[PDB]
Point group: C6
Chain length 187, copies 6
């Protein structure tokens, strides 16, 4: 919509790295998620195919291997890492409407961003066991009889976007560490 003025206000009140590179890599991730990836995952369940005649086996096997979709995880991650930047916008506006205080908020603000980014990257790793999606999954949850072969939709294209989102997120961690280091030695 009119997001230009929102980030425009957030654009000020930041250092060299904070003003430029963090905000660029952030709208970078939103664009990838919105204009490209969301239609890769559009038919994730409609094109899941299992080799069986058992009613209900398809529902339980899809639910077992994809407890939460990748794009829903990324959407949550962006919301979490964008709130601490939004808090200082209101907190500063609150204090300007009517160094140490603004220092502690700002230093804390970038400290949460590192925590959230590392947390979600960890969840991606354990939940999906690496960053590569397989063509074939074997499922033996009830009511599937014995073990059933099921086939994933578009596994290669989903791997490409997964690697891309992880790499950009890994960079944003490094930038946030350095800006912390600049203030740390400054004392």
């Amino acid at each position: 919509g009119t997001l230009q003025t929102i980030l425009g206000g957030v654009n000020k009140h930041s250092t060299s790295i904070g003003k430029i590179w963090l905000t660029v890599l952030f709208i970078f991730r939103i664009m990838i998620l919105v204009v490209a990836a969301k239609e890769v995952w559009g038919d994730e369940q409609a094109d899941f195919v299992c080799n069986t005649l058992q009613p209900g086996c398809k529902n339980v096997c899809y639910d077992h291997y994809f407890p939460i979709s990748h794009i829903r995880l990324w959407a949550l991650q962006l919301i979490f890492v964008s709130t601490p930047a939004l808090l200082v916008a209101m907190h500063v506006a609150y204090r300007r409407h009517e160094e140490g205080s603004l220092w502690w908020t700002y230093t804390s603000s970038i400290f949460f961003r590192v925590i959230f980014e590392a947390a979600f990257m960890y969840v991606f790793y354990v939940m999906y066991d690496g960053f590569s999606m397989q063509r074939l999954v074997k499922c033996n949850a009830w009511p599937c009889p014995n073990t059933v072969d099921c086939f994933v939709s578009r596994p290669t294209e989903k791997t490409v976007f997964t690697v891309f989102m992880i790499a950009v997120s890994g960079i944003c961690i490094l930038l946030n560490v350095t800006e912390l280091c600049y203030l740390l030695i400054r004392y």
Copy 2:
């Protein structure tokens, strides 16, 4: 659309907690509901599967176990808890166009928000019997013969978003209580 100016007007005329944390957690819930959850529930009935040949058994079993969808309940809840904030906006503008009066409205306004939030959380608990969705439901409503097995779509992902929305709502109750307590002891 242009929601920035609406909440911007609502942003003023509030205390420290009211200005910042309540409004942040509120747009937090709207974002979760809009950008993420609404497509989790998109195929709730299209992917409901029952193990039967009886015509019409699928319609009555879905209707029996989901009398109203989760996302419709959350949409109603947000509308209810946002009106009392909107009433004071017009009521104040009405009184400014032409302490005690504004006190009683404001104290009452936050009193309704606690009532609505507690009411909807109660409905969630009794209607759905806890906050965890099951893979399998057993149904014996007419015309289903004897008891029929039916299978839910995406039960695990729906559980994740249910726990998330309940937790955020539970926090908003605590914040509203404290702001009431601050005024209560102030007398």
Copy 3:
């Protein structure tokens, strides 16, 4: 879109009840209709199921029991009850561009709103025979042989939204009567 300025202009030039409560309950109904209800009725015909092999029996039985959908009726009702408020906006602007006259328009304007609201509530009652939707309908229109059982989609959730819309409309009638009574005794 940019509806804030439209109702903002309509917000002025009204009494205490007219400025606040009528306009709040009005955008209340629009929100319920738009963000929640329109996807409850999305699959009204696609999930209508009849127990027969006769080609064309499904089309005629759906058409017989739902001559016009509930959401289309509500959409028409909102359009009708919002025009008399829009007429005075242009009529006043026409008279201000170049008491009794403005009195008669305003008193008439609220008189039509009562008429339309009562009319549509009456149509809801006779056309659908109460405000509760049934799970099963029996149909014997040609070409269905003898009597055929057909099953409605999501009957319970549609009942909840029907009761909600009727109740809010019933309140708007009471508010309009009182504002008429205030002017009536004023003479």
Copy 4:
């Protein structure tokens, strides 16, 4: 979008009837077409059902009885009757950028509107043979063998909106005639 300023500019430079009633009834028709009717006709071909096994008979029978959809006819009609109002907006702005001339344009402008409205109403009558839609159509175009029964989707609801659009259009003809008569006797 931002249609308020467009019609706002068109709102001026008109007489009592032209300023108010014509423009009100015009946006009235647009609202009916947009917010209500366009989803009545959404499944016009997907739910057309024919009692046959002949491949291709459904395509030719739908095309034979609905040479052009009702909503496409109404969309064309609104575009045609709105251009002459838009022409004077540019023509006047052209003459103001750098009585008789403006008289002849204005009198002609309302003369075309009567012609277009009467023309489209005539097409509706002959093409569809009255304003009532039937449940059953019989079709014998090649390749259908002998005569085939086909069934229309939502015939009753489409009849309601057809009568509504014809009635509003018939009123707009009467208003345009009277404004012509006022100028005619004025000489």
Copy 5:
């Protein structure tokens, strides 16, 4: 969106015909393409029906008779004929930021518009062999065995919009020729 100001800027810096009639007929074509025609072609391949059991015959026969859809051709045509008008907007703004020059650009600008309009009309004629769409096409491309009958979706309605778009385009050619002739004799 906010197209009013774009064409508003383009509205100036043109002659009598160029200011009024060309720009009116241009937004005329955009409206027809957007609000009406794009849903006529929505199911062009989903409702293409072939009388065969050969897998893949439907894909190759649709691709053979519709190498590029009509609406995609019209969308390209509008983009091409609108760029030369946009070039002078930037070129003039470039020259005004810091007769013969502006003459040569303007005369050339209208010369390209005639070329593009005539080119696309020629492509329509040879590719589709006239402006009338047929109900039945016969196809013998591999892997279809012998010759297969296939049936087009909504052939009559597509013919109506094809004739309409060709006629409006043919008028825009005539207007551009005359404005060229006015400058030609002027010397």
Copy 6:
């Protein structure tokens, strides 16, 4: 949305070629991608047809021949080549908020655009083996038995848009080289 002001700000601070031709060819590509091409690729997997009875063979053969869709590749390319233009907008605004420096940024900025455009064109060539899409693909990945024939949806129309996007991109490379050459000889 409101993209006019964004590129309007980017419109300034550029040379003759940079201001006009690069930005025109850029929004040219966005329009082709958005309004035309995205619905050519809409049914890419739904209309992929394979001549087999083996469950899961369709999923693996589609994934093998289309590791990433063409429109997703183009969407990524536009995002990459538009960031370096956006970086200087913030970097300049950063330096103006509080020759050589601005020279090095600008010269570097156009140097990355050439790199990205050449890189993506290379990926298109090797991944899809030329710019022409075939009607028939032969697939022997497990679990398909022996070799299976599969048929692509709309191969000819996809070839037309592929050639169009490659040609426009090839021009943007040439323009960027020349602007580099103008500065190079200038020293």
